[PDB]
Amino acid sequence: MIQRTPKIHVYSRHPAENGKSNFLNCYVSGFHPSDIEVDLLKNGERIEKVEHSDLSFSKDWSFYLTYYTEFTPTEKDEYACRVNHVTLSQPKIVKWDRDM
Numbered sequence: 802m803i804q805r806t807p808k809i810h811v812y813s814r815h816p817a818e819n820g821k822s823n824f825l826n827c828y829v830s831g832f833h834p835s836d837i838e839v840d841l842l843k844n845g846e847r848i849e850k851v852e853h854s855d856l857s858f859s860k861d862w863s864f865y866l867t868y869y870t871e872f873t874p875t876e877k878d879e880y881a882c883r884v885n886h887v888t889l890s891q892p893k894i895v896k897w898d899r900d901m
Contacts, residue, residue, distance in 0.1 A: 804833055807829045808831040809893065810828045811825070812828070813874065820874075822871060823872060825874075825897060828866075829865065830865035835858075836886075837886045838885040839853065840883040841883075842894070851868055853867060881897060
């Protein structure tokens, strides 16, 4: 302890329009311990030049932060967020689904 599994939400900054630049965000929250590794993926390949907000902490939401990258969505390309953390037995991959 203390252990709490991350909760992962993947979203674009703006409603997505194919061919219009935007930001893909991966918001990871609710986790303990604070040590975490987060990648953003394009068709399964790691995107380089991903940034993230500073780690924050809430007494209610535990640790949280957001990883993000500029991107241009298309009909054809798959975007996802991959999270590694001590609570997870293997990396957890959450696909961006703009229709959620």
